[PDB]
Amino acid sequence: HGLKGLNSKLLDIRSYLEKVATGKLPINHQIIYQLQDVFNLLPDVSLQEFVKAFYLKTNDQMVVV
Amino acid sequence: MITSAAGIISLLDEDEPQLKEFALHKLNAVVNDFWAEISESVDKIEVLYEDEGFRSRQFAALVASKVFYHLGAFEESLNYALGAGDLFNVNDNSEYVETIIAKCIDHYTKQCVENADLPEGEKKPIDQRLEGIVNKMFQRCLDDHKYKQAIGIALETRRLDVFEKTILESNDVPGMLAYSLKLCMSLMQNK
Amino acid sequence: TSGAVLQAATGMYEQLKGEWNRKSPNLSKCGEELGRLKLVLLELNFLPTTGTKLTKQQLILARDILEIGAQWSILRKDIPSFERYMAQLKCYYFDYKEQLPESAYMHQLLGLNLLFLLSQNRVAEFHTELERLPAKDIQTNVYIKHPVSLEQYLMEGSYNKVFLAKGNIPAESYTFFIDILLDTIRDEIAGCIEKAYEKILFTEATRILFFNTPKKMTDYAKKRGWVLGPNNYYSFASQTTIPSTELAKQVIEYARQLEMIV
Amino acid sequence: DLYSRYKKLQQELEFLEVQEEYIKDEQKNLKK
């Protein structure tokens, strides 16, 4: 359900972006600021440290299970 | 005994036809034990079968089908048995013949039902030869006088033609008709 | 017509035996004579298949013709003919042991087949036929022994000793199979230097891989030539991504199994 | 005869499978 909600929200934001790109509404530099903040905040997974830690702790989880 | 088919299989490689046919005969003789080595060396027997210039198409297909039976494939084995033409014996009532007939029957029934629904499309090849084996079994069963069983296999295959022929040339048309009516009323599902 | 075919085969084989070996015709005429006697064997007892108990001249005719066809395959360097004829030779030798006497020219050819198998590197089948051999014959015989000692040397790695042991050949029949063994040795050392011996230069490579002249090794660069590094070092032994989806499948499966009523 | 019993066996085996799924679903509902 959480995945579905996230998908719907990003559908909404994409639709708004399309409206702006087509020019159906004015550019809001604030909303932009927020969007590129989000993207800037996106993580990196293939970091080769994050991955080692991920495997290690997944190993512990599987051990207990 | 022979303890190894290496010699015979290697000999079959040679172009000399007479040699090739005799090797095929001996391989058919000793297949039951060395099916594994024959499996390893199928490729060349496949070439021998497929190149129809060689006048041992039926024998090659039969030996290949027997080999694939021993392996357990039961599908390419079936096709090779089919390609053995009429060389395959049906009244030998051996284990191999019996089981391949069973596979033929079930497979054919499957394609029968498939097409049964399919209005006209697909119309699987139903390798007329497969039709031939099913018909041959039909007549063998008629000879044994298993009219019930002929009727029911005809029903399963949807072969109304064979069903009607067996019921008409049955031993007692009224009783046969009553039995068929009961089966139709109760067991049959497809409207 | 049993006697007719028997005597026909006997005369044909007598002519062959007399001509090809005593002197060395070793001709396509001899090969065609072999083909003729083979077509004769066809109708003859053939590979006995057991269930015969004839003590037929099958022994003489089949054993001799197969051995001669094998040595003919050797002379012509036709590996398929060699292998097929030796396959029949096995089927005869090891099948009807008691019903047949010792084949005086059997261990020689069988040891030559040892060399054949070693040269092709088919070590698994080599050891299988070894074990099928009687135990004592492994050591008592020279024909059998020599390939075995060579194989032990190869397995150990003393390739220098292997090359040194070229001369000690019990029978001249062990010819050109030695050469197949040599180029197999070369390929073995090739893989050796490939996955180990990092960055070996040309001079060391030539001295170790007993190839011919440095031009000939430049040709051997046909053998994928590695990369020759900067200084003909023949390169070297050439040398994340969270498996998220598959691990998710695995854990979902764990939950599924934990969850069904079953 | 033989095929009558054969098809009866078909019917009852299928129905028995249906019984299996019935009981599994009902066991879940009864736990709830």
Coordinates of all heavy atoms in Angstrom, one line a residue, chain B residues 12-63:
Chain B
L12 N 29.3 -47.1 -37.1 CA 28.2 -46.5 -37.9 C 28.6 -45.2 -38.5 O 28.0 -44.8 -39.5 CB 27.0 -46.2 -36.9 CG 25.8 -45.8 -37.7 CD1 25.3 -47.0 -38.5 CD2 24.7 -45.3 -36.8
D13 N 29.7 -44.6 -38.0 CA 30.1 -43.3 -38.6 C 30.5 -43.5 -40.1 O 30.3 -42.5 -40.9 CB 31.3 -42.8 -37.9 CG 31.1 -42.7 -36.4 OD1 29.9 -42.5 -36.0 OD2 32.1 -42.8 -35.6
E14 N 31.0 -44.6 -40.5 CA 31.5 -44.8 -41.8 C 30.4 -44.7 -42.9 O 29.3 -45.2 -42.6 CB 32.2 -46.2 -41.9 CG 33.5 -46.2 -41.1 CD 34.5 -45.2 -41.5 OE1 34.5 -44.6 -42.6 OE2 35.4 -44.8 -40.6
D15 N 30.7 -44.2 -44.1 CA 29.7 -44.0 -45.1 C 29.2 -45.3 -45.7 O 28.1 -45.3 -46.2 CB 30.4 -43.2 -46.3 CG 30.7 -41.8 -45.8 OD1 30.1 -41.2 -44.9 OD2 31.7 -41.3 -46.4
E16 N 29.9 -46.4 -45.6 CA 29.5 -47.6 -46.2 C 28.1 -48.0 -45.8 O 27.8 -48.4 -44.6 CB 30.4 -48.8 -45.9 CG 29.9 -50.2 -46.3 CD 29.3 -50.2 -47.6 OE1 29.7 -49.4 -48.5 OE2 28.4 -51.0 -47.8
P17 N 27.1 -47.9 -46.6 CA 25.7 -48.1 -46.2 C 25.5 -49.5 -45.6 O 25.1 -49.5 -44.5 CB 24.9 -47.9 -47.5 CG 25.9 -47.9 -48.6 CD 27.2 -47.5 -48.1
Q18 N 25.8 -50.5 -46.4 CA 25.6 -51.9 -45.8 C 26.0 -52.0 -44.4 O 25.3 -52.5 -43.5 CB 26.3 -52.9 -46.7 CG 25.6 -54.2 -46.9 CD 26.5 -55.2 -47.7 OE1 27.5 -54.8 -48.2 NE2 26.0 -56.4 -47.8
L19 N 27.3 -51.5 -44.1 CA 27.7 -51.4 -42.7 C 26.8 -50.6 -41.9 O 26.5 -51.0 -40.7 CB 29.1 -50.8 -42.7 CG 30.3 -51.8 -42.7 CD1 30.4 -52.5 -41.3 CD2 30.3 -52.8 -43.8
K20 N 26.3 -49.5 -42.4 CA 25.5 -48.6 -41.6 C 24.2 -49.3 -41.2 O 23.8 -49.3 -40.0 CB 25.2 -47.3 -42.4 CG 25.2 -46.1 -41.6 CD 25.1 -44.8 -42.4 CE 26.4 -44.4 -43.1 NZ 26.2 -43.2 -43.9
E21 N 23.6 -50.0 -42.1 CA 22.3 -50.7 -41.8 C 22.6 -51.8 -40.8 O 21.8 -52.1 -39.9 CB 21.7 -51.3 -43.1 CG 21.1 -50.2 -44.0 CD 22.0 -49.9 -45.2 OE1 23.0 -50.6 -45.4 OE2 21.7 -49.0 -46.0
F22 N 23.7 -52.6 -41.0 CA 23.9 -53.7 -40.1 C 24.2 -53.2 -38.7 O 23.7 -53.8 -37.7 CB 25.0 -54.6 -40.6 CG 24.6 -55.5 -41.8 CD1 23.6 -55.1 -42.6 CD2 25.3 -56.6 -42.1 CE1 23.2 -55.9 -43.7 CE2 25.0 -57.4 -43.1 CZ 23.9 -57.1 -44.0
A23 N 24.9 -52.1 -38.6 CA 25.2 -51.5 -37.3 C 23.9 -51.1 -36.7 O 23.6 -51.3 -35.5 CB 26.1 -50.4 -37.4
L24 N 23.0 -50.5 -37.5 CA 21.7 -50.1 -37.0 C 20.9 -51.3 -36.4 O 20.3 -51.3 -35.3 CB 20.8 -49.4 -38.1 CG 21.0 -47.9 -38.2 CD1 20.4 -47.4 -39.5 CD2 20.3 -47.2 -37.0
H25 N 21.0 -52.4 -37.1 CA 20.3 -53.6 -36.7 C 20.8 -54.1 -35.4 O 20.1 -54.4 -34.4 CB 20.4 -54.7 -37.8 CG 19.6 -54.4 -39.0 ND1 20.2 -53.8 -40.1 CD2 18.3 -54.6 -39.3 CE1 19.2 -53.7 -41.0 NE2 18.1 -54.2 -40.6
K26 N 22.1 -54.2 -35.2 CA 22.7 -54.7 -34.0 C 22.5 -53.7 -32.8 O 22.2 -54.1 -31.7 CB 24.2 -54.9 -34.2 CG 24.5 -56.1 -35.1 CD 26.0 -56.4 -35.1 CE 26.5 -57.2 -33.9 NZ 25.9 -58.5 -33.9
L27 N 22.5 -52.4 -33.1 CA 22.1 -51.4 -32.1 C 20.7 -51.6 -31.6 O 20.4 -51.6 -30.4 CB 22.3 -50.0 -32.6 CG 23.8 -49.6 -32.9 CD1 23.8 -48.2 -33.5 CD2 24.6 -49.6 -31.6
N28 N 19.8 -51.8 -32.5 CA 18.4 -52.1 -32.1 C 18.4 -53.4 -31.3 O 17.6 -53.5 -30.4 CB 17.5 -52.3 -33.4 CG 16.1 -52.5 -33.0 OD1 15.7 -52.5 -31.8 ND2 15.2 -52.6 -34.0
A29 N 19.2 -54.4 -31.7 CA 19.2 -55.6 -30.9 C 19.6 -55.4 -29.4 O 19.0 -55.9 -28.5 CB 20.1 -56.6 -31.6
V30 N 20.7 -54.6 -29.2 CA 21.3 -54.4 -27.9 C 20.9 -53.1 -27.3 O 21.6 -52.6 -26.4 CB 22.8 -54.6 -28.0 CG1 23.1 -55.9 -28.7 CG2 23.4 -53.4 -28.7
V31 N 19.9 -52.4 -27.7 CA 19.5 -51.1 -27.2 C 19.2 -51.1 -25.8 O 19.6 -50.2 -25.0 CB 18.4 -50.5 -28.1 CG1 17.1 -51.3 -27.9 CG2 18.1 -49.0 -27.6
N32 N 18.5 -52.1 -25.3 CA 17.9 -52.1 -24.0 C 18.9 -51.8 -22.9 O 18.6 -51.2 -21.9 CB 17.2 -53.4 -23.7 CG 15.8 -53.4 -24.2 OD1 15.1 -52.4 -24.3 ND2 15.3 -54.6 -24.6
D33 N 20.2 -52.2 -23.1 CA 21.2 -52.0 -22.0 C 22.1 -50.8 -22.2 O 22.3 -50.1 -21.3 CB 22.1 -53.3 -21.9 CG 23.0 -53.4 -23.2 OD1 22.8 -52.6 -24.1 OD2 23.8 -54.4 -23.2
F34 N 22.5 -50.5 -23.5 CA 23.4 -49.4 -23.7 C 22.7 -48.2 -24.2 O 23.3 -47.4 -25.0 CB 24.5 -49.9 -24.7 CG 25.4 -51.0 -24.2 CD1 25.3 -51.4 -22.9 CD2 26.4 -51.5 -25.0 CE1 26.1 -52.4 -22.5 CE2 27.2 -52.4 -24.6 CZ 27.1 -52.9 -23.3
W35 N 21.5 -48.0 -23.8 CA 20.8 -46.7 -24.1 C 21.6 -45.5 -23.8 O 21.5 -44.5 -24.4 CB 19.4 -46.7 -23.5 CG 19.5 -46.7 -22.0 CD1 19.6 -47.8 -21.2 CD2 19.6 -45.5 -21.2 NE1 19.7 -47.3 -19.9 CE2 19.6 -46.0 -19.9 CE3 19.5 -44.2 -21.4 CZ2 19.7 -45.1 -18.8 CZ3 19.6 -43.3 -20.4 CH2 19.7 -43.8 -19.1
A36 N 22.4 -45.6 -22.7 CA 23.2 -44.4 -22.3 C 24.2 -44.0 -23.3 O 24.3 -42.9 -23.7 CB 23.8 -44.7 -20.9
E37 N 25.1 -45.0 -23.7 CA 26.1 -44.7 -24.7 C 25.4 -44.3 -26.0 O 25.9 -43.4 -26.7 CB 27.0 -45.9 -25.0 CG 27.5 -46.6 -23.7 CD 26.5 -47.6 -23.1 OE1 25.3 -47.3 -23.3 OE2 26.9 -48.6 -22.5
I38 N 24.3 -45.0 -26.4 CA 23.6 -44.6 -27.6 C 23.1 -43.2 -27.5 O 23.2 -42.4 -28.5 CB 22.4 -45.6 -27.9 CG1 23.0 -47.0 -28.0 CG2 21.7 -45.2 -29.1 CD1 22.0 -48.1 -27.6
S39 N 22.7 -42.8 -26.3 CA 22.3 -41.4 -26.1 C 23.4 -40.5 -26.4 O 23.3 -39.5 -27.1 CB 21.8 -41.2 -24.6 OG 21.0 -42.3 -24.2
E40 N 24.6 -40.8 -25.8 CA 25.8 -39.9 -26.0 C 26.0 -39.7 -27.5 O 26.4 -38.7 -28.0 CB 27.0 -40.6 -25.4 CG 27.2 -40.1 -23.9 CD 28.5 -40.6 -23.4 OE1 29.1 -41.5 -24.0 OE2 29.0 -40.0 -22.4
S41 N 25.8 -40.8 -28.3 CA 26.1 -40.8 -29.7 C 24.9 -40.7 -30.6 O 24.9 -41.1 -31.7 CB 26.9 -42.0 -30.1 OG 28.1 -42.1 -29.4
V42 N 23.8 -40.1 -30.0 CA 22.6 -39.9 -30.8 C 22.9 -39.1 -32.1 O 22.5 -39.5 -33.2 CB 21.5 -39.3 -30.0 CG1 20.4 -38.6 -30.9 CG2 20.8 -40.3 -29.1
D43 N 23.5 -38.0 -31.9 CA 23.7 -37.0 -33.0 C 23.9 -37.7 -34.4 O 23.2 -37.4 -35.3 CB 24.9 -36.1 -32.7 CG 26.1 -37.0 -32.2 OD1 25.9 -38.2 -32.1 OD2 27.1 -36.4 -31.8
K44 N 24.8 -38.6 -34.5 CA 25.1 -39.3 -35.7 C 23.9 -40.1 -36.2 O 23.5 -40.2 -37.3 CB 26.3 -40.2 -35.6 CG 26.3 -41.2 -34.5 CD 25.8 -42.6 -34.9 CE 25.9 -43.5 -33.7 NZ 25.4 -44.9 -34.0
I45 N 23.1 -40.7 -35.2 CA 21.9 -41.4 -35.6 C 20.9 -40.5 -36.1 O 20.1 -40.8 -37.0 CB 21.4 -42.3 -34.5 CG1 20.6 -43.5 -35.1 CG2 20.4 -41.6 -33.6 CD1 20.5 -44.7 -34.1
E46 N 20.8 -39.3 -35.5 CA 19.9 -38.2 -36.0 C 20.2 -37.9 -37.5 O 19.4 -37.7 -38.3 CB 20.0 -37.0 -35.2 CG 19.7 -37.2 -33.7 CD 18.2 -37.7 -33.5 OE1 17.5 -37.7 -34.5 OE2 17.8 -38.0 -32.4
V47 N 21.5 -37.7 -37.8 CA 21.9 -37.4 -39.1 C 21.5 -38.6 -40.1 O 21.0 -38.3 -41.1 CB 23.5 -37.2 -39.2 CG1 23.9 -36.9 -40.6 CG2 23.8 -36.0 -38.3
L48 N 21.7 -39.8 -39.6 CA 21.4 -41.0 -40.4 C 19.9 -41.0 -40.7 O 19.5 -41.3 -41.8 CB 21.9 -42.2 -39.7 CG 21.8 -43.5 -40.6 CD1 22.6 -44.6 -39.8 CD2 20.4 -44.0 -40.8
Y49 N 19.1 -40.7 -39.7 CA 17.6 -40.7 -39.9 C 17.3 -39.5 -40.9 O 16.6 -39.8 -41.9 CB 16.9 -40.5 -38.6 CG 15.5 -39.9 -38.8 CD1 14.4 -40.7 -39.1 CD2 15.3 -38.5 -38.7 CE1 13.2 -40.2 -39.2 CE2 14.1 -38.0 -38.9 CZ 13.0 -38.8 -39.1 OH 11.7 -38.3 -39.3
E50 N 17.7 -38.3 -40.6 CA 17.2 -37.2 -41.3 C 17.6 -37.2 -42.8 O 16.8 -36.9 -43.7 CB 17.7 -35.9 -40.7 CG 19.2 -35.8 -40.5 CD 19.9 -35.2 -41.8 OE1 19.1 -34.7 -42.7 OE2 21.1 -35.3 -41.9
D51 N 18.9 -37.6 -43.1 CA 19.2 -37.7 -44.5 C 18.5 -38.8 -45.2 O 18.9 -40.0 -45.2 CB 20.8 -37.9 -44.7 CG 21.3 -39.1 -44.0 OD1 20.5 -39.9 -43.4 OD2 22.5 -39.4 -44.2
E52 N 17.3 -38.5 -45.8 CA 16.4 -39.5 -46.3 C 17.0 -40.2 -47.5 O 16.4 -41.3 -47.9 CB 15.1 -38.8 -46.7 CG 14.2 -38.5 -45.5 CD 12.9 -37.9 -45.9 OE1 12.8 -37.5 -47.1 OE2 12.0 -37.7 -45.1
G53 N 18.1 -39.8 -48.1 CA 18.8 -40.6 -49.1 C 19.1 -42.0 -48.6 O 19.0 -42.9 -49.4
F54 N 19.5 -42.1 -47.4 CA 19.8 -43.4 -46.8 C 18.4 -44.2 -46.6 O 17.5 -43.7 -46.1 CB 20.5 -43.3 -45.5 CG 21.0 -44.6 -45.0 CD1 22.1 -45.2 -45.7 CD2 20.6 -45.2 -43.8 CE1 22.6 -46.4 -45.2 CE2 21.1 -46.4 -43.4 CZ 22.1 -47.0 -44.1
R55 N 18.4 -45.4 -47.1 CA 17.1 -46.2 -47.2 C 17.0 -47.0 -45.9 O 16.6 -48.2 -45.9 CB 17.1 -47.1 -48.4 CG 18.0 -48.3 -48.3 CD 19.5 -48.0 -48.7 NE 20.3 -49.2 -48.8 CZ 21.6 -49.2 -49.0 NH1 22.3 -48.1 -49.1 NH2 22.2 -50.4 -49.1
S56 N 17.1 -46.3 -44.7 CA 16.8 -46.9 -43.4 C 16.1 -45.8 -42.6 O 16.3 -45.7 -41.4 CB 18.1 -47.4 -42.7 OG 18.8 -48.2 -43.6
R57 N 15.3 -45.0 -43.2 CA 14.6 -43.9 -42.5 C 13.8 -44.5 -41.3 O 13.9 -44.1 -40.2 CB 13.7 -43.1 -43.4 CG 13.4 -41.7 -42.9 CD 12.3 -41.8 -41.8 NE 11.2 -42.6 -42.2 CZ 10.1 -42.2 -42.8 NH1 10.0 -40.9 -43.3 NH2 9.1 -43.0 -43.1
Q58 N 12.9 -45.5 -41.6 CA 12.1 -46.1 -40.6 C 12.9 -46.7 -39.5 O 12.6 -46.5 -38.3 CB 11.1 -47.1 -41.2 CG 10.0 -46.5 -42.0 CD 10.5 -46.0 -43.4 OE1 11.6 -45.6 -43.5 NE2 9.6 -46.0 -44.4
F59 N 13.9 -47.5 -39.8 CA 14.7 -48.1 -38.8 C 15.4 -47.1 -37.9 O 15.5 -47.3 -36.7 CB 15.7 -49.1 -39.4 CG 16.2 -50.1 -38.4 CD1 15.8 -51.4 -38.4 CD2 17.2 -49.7 -37.6 CE1 16.3 -52.3 -37.5 CE2 17.7 -50.6 -36.7 CZ 17.2 -51.9 -36.6
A60 N 16.0 -46.1 -38.5 CA 16.7 -45.1 -37.8 C 15.7 -44.4 -36.8 O 16.0 -44.2 -35.6 CB 17.3 -44.0 -38.7
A61 N 14.5 -44.0 -37.3 CA 13.5 -43.4 -36.4 C 13.1 -44.3 -35.3 O 13.0 -43.8 -34.2 CB 12.3 -43.0 -37.3
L62 N 12.9 -45.6 -35.6 CA 12.5 -46.5 -34.5 C 13.6 -46.6 -33.5 O 13.3 -46.6 -32.3 CB 12.2 -47.9 -35.1 CG 11.7 -48.9 -34.2 CD1 10.8 -49.9 -34.9 CD2 12.8 -49.7 -33.5
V63 N 14.9 -46.8 -33.9 CA 15.9 -46.9 -32.9 C 16.1 -45.7 -32.1 O 16.3 -45.7 -30.9 CB 17.2 -47.3 -33.5 CG1 17.1 -48.7 -34.1 CG2 17.7 -46.3 -34.6

